Every structure is written in C-alpha cells, then in structure tokens.
Amino acid sequence: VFLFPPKPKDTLMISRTPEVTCVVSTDPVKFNWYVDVEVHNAKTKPREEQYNSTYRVVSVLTVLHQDWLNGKEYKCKVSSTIEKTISKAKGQPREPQVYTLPPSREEMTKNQVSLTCLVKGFYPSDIAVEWESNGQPENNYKTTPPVLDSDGSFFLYSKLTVDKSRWQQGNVFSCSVMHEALHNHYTQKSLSL
C-alpha cells in the first residue's frame, strides 16, 4: 500500500481537480477512505498485473482544494487491514521569490542557450513551474526537484532551452510559478535579451 499526494497545479486552481492516489496473485481488495471519518467517493481501477505476476489495484480519492490545503489528513484502508496516511506538509507557507537569469556569455557560442528560472524561499515544496513565450507554452524545459535550503525553505531551478537565434532576436520568455503562498497562486517573470 502506497499513498501519493495530488499534483501541485491541481490544488492551486479551483478549475483543476486534485486527487489522492492509493496504489497497491491468486485471490485479490476493499478500499476504505477516511479523511481525519469515512468517505465513499473514491473510484478504483481494476487489477492490472506486471512482469512478476502480482496485481496492482489503484484507487483514487477526489479531494477538496481547501481540505488538502488546510492540512486535513487522508487515510487509505486496504484490506486483516493495512493503513497509510498523507497530508500536506505542516507549516506557515512562505512566498517564493522568482528570478529569471539570462544565459552565460560563455554559453552564447553554443547554438542553443539556457534561460534559467531560479525559484527561492518557498514552503512547502509543492510547486509548479512552466515556460511561455507569446502566450504559447514552451516544450523544451526541465525543472529540478525542490532542494531543501539551509533555512528550512526550498528552492529549485528551471532551465528552458532555445535556439540562440530566438534569444538573440529579442523574443520574450516567461517563467510561470504556481505555489499556494503566491497571490492568486501564480506569478510570472519574463526574460529577454
């Protein structure tokens, strides 16, 4: 039995649907879901198997945004019985600082440049970062996991890669960050030559 938390972007906008996932040979399992009180609205995927001939029943509970965000605990009961609990990390959320950073002058000799988004000082570590230009999203980026900082908050970097030609010619790129301590759960910093 293993209990996973919902995706960051899904809890931070009322339009998404956040979601707790409980993931688990000859005689398979009843799921019970209490929320710090039994709940009945979880859906359950049928048993799919693997190379090792074990079943893998996944169950999915749909959680309320403020429930998950206000710290409510989520209990998965997979039957005797075995348990597992999760909730949001405890503690005063902290607002992230978002800085864009142009490519190194030593990188300008490559045919592709790195645009950097440093996100600093947020808590808890749940966060989504994205990249845009001209309103359309940018595919070619990669974001590092949150890394605990000497001060108990978190940072990460996100690296967007573009042809040098798009950067040289003045195109504007934006780093979009979603975190609960941000006003409207969202901020963006733009970058350009």
Ligand X SMILES: *[C@@H]1O[C@H](CO)[C@@H](O[C@@H]2O[C@H](CO)[C@@H](O[C@@H]3O[C@H](CO[C@H]4O[C@H](CO)[C@@H](O)[C@H](O)[C@@H]4O[C@@H]4O[C@H](CO)[C@@H](O[C@@H]5O[C@H](CO)[C@H](O)[C@H](O)[C@H]5O)[C@H](O)[C@H]4NC(C)=O)[C@@H](O)[C@H](O[C@H]4O[C@H](CO)[C@@H](O)[C@H](O)[C@@H]4O)[C@@H]3O)[C@H](O)[C@H]2NC(C)=O)[C@H](O)[C@H]1NC(C)=O
Ligand Y SMILES: C[C@@H]1O[C@@H](O)[C@@H](O)[C@H](O)[C@@H]1O
Phi/psi of residue 47, nearest 5 degrees = -65, 115
The CA-atom distances, in angstroms, between 165 and each of 26, 102, 168 are: 60, 14, 5
Q: Is 45 in the site for ligand X (CB under 6 A)?
A: no
Q: Which is nearer to ligand X, 41 or 52 (CB)?
A: 52
Q: Which is nearer to ligand Y, 41 or 50 (CB)?
A: 50
Q: Which of 171, 155, 176 is nearest to 102 (CA)?
A: 171
Q: Is 25 in the site for ligand Y (CB under 6 A)?
A: no
Span of 1-9, 101-109, 120-128, 133-141 interacting with ligand X by CB under 6 A: 1-9
Q: Is 114 in the site for its own copies (CB under 8 A)?
A: yes
**Partner from ligand Y, ligand X, its own copies, none binding residue 44, C-beta < 5-8 Å depending on class:** none
Minimal distance, residue 191 CB to its own copies, in Å: 10
Minimal distance, residue 48 CB to ligand Y, in Å: 9
Given CA atoms 78, 22, 76, 85 in this order, what sign does their dihedral have? positive
Q: Which of 65, 25, 30 is nearest to 44 (CA)?
A: 30
What whole-number distance in Å separates Cα of residue 69 and Cα of residue 90? 10
CB atoms near residue 138 (< 10 Å): 18
Binding residues (CB under 6 A) for ligand Y: these are: 50-52
Binding residues (CB under 8 A) for its own copies: these are: 97, 99-104, 106-107, 110, 114, 116, 118, 120, 140, 142-145, 147-150, 155-157, 159, 161, 189
